[PDB]
């Protein structure tokens, strides 16, 4: 759970070049932050891991 | 002698700013000493300027990385990683303060031990 | 005499620190071998995704 | 001191940076997320073929 | 349709091949001045952070040449070199004084 | 760093990393050479005193 | 005069100044004392050292 949370976070950041919304910037592999958040373990497991 | 003298007078004017240059005995020895001092000061001022500008740049870079790591940890571990117990915070501060005291690149044992 | 005592203390200290370092080094060596195994496992998982 | 310095050089050399394994994990996760998106796109073309 | 379908032929494989060649850390861009995004690996503070960083081998060599320990923070390199220059000046002055005294 | 080591604002049009390592090695050598000269000078002085 | 020398030598460790230099040149000694605060312990300008 912890490894997966860290990995998702690391990869989310790879995608979010904090750059300026350009409404037009082509993401790597066409992936958005939301596509990665879906690969997170179930919310009950994430809270358990953080506690 | 005339060139060294000019350099000294210019240097003294720079150092004393708007204050009238104090009268001093101008002999071969006093001029040599002042000249060595002027050369030394000029060379050090240059070095210190370069170091000061670099530290400003490094301060910006460290700040940027700190923000990055904070964001990474918040997104990955949640806000709860910042809610450590009093003792936990004390332990964290001691590691941090020890590393700063030894001017380490990071908190790894590979850095702490040799230091 | 104080110097001899001080140097003996220092010698003992260096011996203890050397021993500790040797432990840390052995531990790290073992960890580095196992990390290579992880690299191989993760390499297989990556081939599955491909 | 010479022994300690040799041992130090060895520890510094062993600084296990599992960066390669971590890179592979990141790539794997990103590609998994990519695969999921491409599966959704395949399902959409399948629907068009049925029509 | 034939033309557009041909464009999308092996589209997944083509993309994966280009992805496999990219360096992921090059994607991590940080803004130091709020305006210019630079890859974190290109930051001067990270030149010694990882053995795999592009400039690690070069700076390792520079640290060893100026006798600066590898555990020291990268921000210390210029200050240290400045001190070394200061020392050189002092040694020259000492030599000159001693040569005069002899 | 290059400016700090070379002193000479000689606007070298192309600064290389290999050049930077060389100038850094030179500073270290200069300091070592100066320390050796001082040591010699100290021996000379000691001989004269003897 | 001995005090002036000690002060100048401590702050301007690079200067090889002898007592004969300050005895023959009293006004020069005053100049050096005035320069000492303007020059930091390392030979650099006091302002730049503060910065």
From Swiss-Prot, chain F:
It is found in: Cytoplasm, Cytoskeleton, Microtubule organizing center, Centrosome; Cytoplasm, Cytoskeleton, Spindle. Residues 15-46 form a coiled coil. Belongs to the HAUS3 family. Component of the HAUS augmin-like complex. The complex interacts with the gamma-tubulin ring complex and this interaction is required for spindle assembly. Contributes to mitotic spindle assembly, maintenance of centrosome integrity and completion of cytokinesis as part of the HAUS augmin-like complex. This is HAUS augmin-like complex subunit 3. It comes from Xenopus laevis. The gene is haus3.
């Amino acid at each position: 759970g912890l490894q997966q949370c860290m990995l998702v976070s690391e990869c989310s950041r790879l995608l979010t070049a904090d750059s300026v919304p350009p409404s037009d910037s082509t993401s790597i592999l066409g992936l958005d932050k939301q596509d990665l958040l879906d690969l997170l373990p179930p919310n009950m497991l994430v809270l358990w891991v953080r506690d | 002698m005339d060139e060294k003298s000019t350099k000294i007078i210019m240097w003294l004017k720079k150092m004393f700013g708007d204050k009238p240059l104090p009268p001093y005995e101008v002999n071969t020895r006093t001029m040599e000493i002042l000249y060595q001092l002027a050369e030394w000061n000029e060379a050090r001022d240059k070095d210190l300027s370069l170091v000061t500008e670099d530290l400003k740049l490094k301060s910006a870079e460290v700040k940027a990385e700190a923000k990055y790591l904070q964001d990474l940890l918040t997104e990955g571990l949640g806000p709860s990683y910042t809610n450590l117990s009093r003792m936990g915070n004390n332990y964290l501060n001691q590691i941090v303060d020890s590393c700063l005291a030894l001017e380490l690149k990071n908190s790894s044992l590979s850095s702490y031990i040799p230091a | 005499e104080e110097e001899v005592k001080a140097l003996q203390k220092q010698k003992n200290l260096h011996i203890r620190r050397r021993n500790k370092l040797q432990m840390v080094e052995s531990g790290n060596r073992q960890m580095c071998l196992k990390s290579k195994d992880k690299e191989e496992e993760t390499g297989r998982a990556f081939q599955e995704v491909l | 001191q010479e022994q300690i310095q040799t041992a130090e050089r060895e520890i510094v050399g062993q600084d296990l940076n599992c960066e390669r394994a971590q890179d592979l994990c990141r790539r794997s996760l990103l590609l998994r997320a990519f695969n999921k998106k491409r599966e959704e796109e395949c399902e959409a073309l399948c629907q068009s073929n049925k029509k | 349709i034939i033309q557009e379908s041909q464009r999308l032929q092996d589209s997944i494989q083509k993309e994966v091949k280009h992805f496999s060649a990219i360096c992921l850390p090059a994607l991590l861009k940080v803004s130091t001045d709020g305006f210019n995004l630079l890859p974190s690996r290109e930051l001067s503070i990270n030149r010694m952070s990882n053995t795999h960083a592009p400039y690690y081998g070069i700076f390792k060599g520079i640290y060893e040449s100026v006798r600066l320990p590898l555990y020291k923070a990268p921000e210390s390199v210029l200050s240290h070199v400045a001190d070394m220059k200061k020392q050189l000046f002092f040694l020259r002055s000492q030599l000159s004084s001693r040569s005069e005294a002899i | 760093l290059y400016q700090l080591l070379d002193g000479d604002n000689t606007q070298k049009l192309f600064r290389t990393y290999d050049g930077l390592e060389s100038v850094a090695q030179k500073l270290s050598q200069d300091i070592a050479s100066m320390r050796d000269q001082l040591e010699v000078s100290e021996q000379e002085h000691s001989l004269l005193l003897s | 005069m001995a005090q002036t020398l000690q002060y100048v030598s401590s702050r301007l460790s690079m200067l090889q100044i002898d007592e004969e230099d300050l005895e023959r040149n009293a006004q020069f000694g005053k100049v050096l004392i005035e320069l000492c605060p303007l020059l930091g312990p390392n030979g650099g300008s006091a302002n730049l050292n503060r910065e």
